[PDB]
Write a protein that binds this DNA or RNA. Sequence first.
RNA 1: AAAA
Lengths: 372, 372
Amino acid sequence: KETILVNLVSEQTIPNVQFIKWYFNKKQTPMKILLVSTKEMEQKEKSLFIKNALHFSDSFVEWETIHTDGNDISKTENILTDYFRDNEYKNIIVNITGGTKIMSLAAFDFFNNKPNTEIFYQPIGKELQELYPNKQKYDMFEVLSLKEYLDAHGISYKYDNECVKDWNYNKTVYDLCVADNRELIKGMIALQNNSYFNNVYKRKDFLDFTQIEEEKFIAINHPAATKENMIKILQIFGFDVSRIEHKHIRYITGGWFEEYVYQKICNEYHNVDEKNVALNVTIQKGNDKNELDVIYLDKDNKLHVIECKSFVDGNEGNRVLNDALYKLQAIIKSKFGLYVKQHLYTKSIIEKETPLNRAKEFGIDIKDGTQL
Amino acid sequence: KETILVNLVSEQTIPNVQFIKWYFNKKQTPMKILLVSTKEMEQKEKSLFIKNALHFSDSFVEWETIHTDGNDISKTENILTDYFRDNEYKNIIVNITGGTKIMSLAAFDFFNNKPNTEIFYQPIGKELQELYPNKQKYDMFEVLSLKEYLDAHGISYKYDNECVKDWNYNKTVYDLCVADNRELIKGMIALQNNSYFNNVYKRKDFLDFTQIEEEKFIAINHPAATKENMIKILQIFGFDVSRIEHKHIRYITGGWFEEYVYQKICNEYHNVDEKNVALNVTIQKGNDKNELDVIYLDKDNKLHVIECKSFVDGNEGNRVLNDALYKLQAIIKSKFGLYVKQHLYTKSIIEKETPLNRAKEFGIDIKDGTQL
RNA sequence: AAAA
Ligand SMILES: [Mn+2]
Ligand SMILES: [Mn+2]
């Protein structure tokens, strides 16, 4: 353990996780990691998130998290001298991006003009630069996987990338099946949310719509949700009426748009790696679960969350869109750090001032039907 | 001007606005304020927001905003030296709280151990400490008004703390009129959202409920909303049925709870000054306006936003509570700064696990019916 | 407390 990595622990874990893995990628030496943290951050389990994201091996690296006062500059510098008494280390690498300005400046005054030390700073959205001894800039490109990102936030997640239909079908599914049958799709939405149908698919995996009683379809109490209309729209999308699973119904009522968005990202977006894209994702931190439609990590390590609303047209759509904007911004601002971009994708045309102004102030990128 | 105040401009304007007004309050000298900013912040109008909150006499203080690279440490140092060559200033005061770490440590190294300079740092939520020349701590208590807080964020707002009823009435309004008439209030809620009733109040200020025909009351299509039931509940609250205003209906359908929360804060809360309490305020930044029920600034200068939901009972209530939590978190995390506490007040008893877990993860303090 |  002849190389030590000194990092300051604060709310944003990415600057530390990104930096540490990068040094691991360039210099594959075994190291000891010194995380300078505080009582406040250790209560939020921040240094632990740093460990689990990189999930090194006990042999390869040693982690030590030491405590200091985040606001006493002289205490942070004094704790550093006591630790580096008659130092045996051959390479001292210091990343002053984390912590408070007090914590960073305190560590900086101790390590500046030190004989065996490299000092780095990571400006957000820019390439990592070292400040001492030589002023240099390094590219932080493709350094992090998606799993490493969410692990740094203490997030557990599951996803299902299985699509009911393939990319070639999803490129034309709107023009061929959706546009001319939106009233029939509204009937299936009523079917999907009907008390009986939602509970029977808890009991059976497939369902034969031909052998379903007719009374069950009228109990839905929606004009479009007739037995003939529902069987017809199932056939329009190319499903086997004898073997209908809940996944197929979810596809018709808008699940197609999520798969269209998901596959478009995997196949057309070149600044994102296909392996870092997830569909129908569910996150959990502190036993709080949220479902995000499509999330991905681009080559620049910025996280992108997309809320997919197939159609939000009509005035009852503006009520749905405003809730989607609030829901999206609430989730992303609380669960994720500062390096995220919010998106709302829709096939309907958003031409009303209030959602557009709300989105611009929230920072939510909208990709309208005009841009799809 | 013989005193200069150097501040770094960044996302958070409160630490600069707080500090500058404090030094003005302590020394009362005419001074020049040098705002060290960047291209990125001047696009967000940050230095403009800072000046505006203070609004000092043009004669008594002069502002100069100079630009730098937030990530170039040597460039920020050079702009400082060129500016202070043969400086005429007797007192140079430096507040390194703003800006990036690069900007902060650069400003620190330029002024550290230089004569006629005081260096300050403002840790969030603690007393302001100066680091040079003498280590000292100062109290930032009752330093900021509510108006100064919202002005520092570029927010336009209007409010009238006018209540339909007074504190003496709003204490006990629940026990005397609301608790035993919850079904009658639901009819009035249905009445408030009826197309006819909401539109006539667009044209007329008073309404005579005695000459409204019953056919208008059954068009509401709510079991409780009979003409006698609505006349009954209006008189229970003490309103004149011959001339009922929109304020009176809005009061019954939960507006009473906003006034109760507002007045309780003004009369019972020990850490907040009544002049820093606002009711039914509507904010606007960019071109997006939202309405907040009760917001106030406590004597510690932390802003408190309250979402008042009178009742969230039943399955139809959880959807309102779930939406209120997203909406609250979305606004305060996007429109306000780092030093805010979010609250949701309700008369109902919240025991459901998921909303409590959501609120705790969002950081939303909930005060249910247990704590009136 | 990657621009309290
Ligand atoms: Mn969806
Ligand atoms: Mn409300």
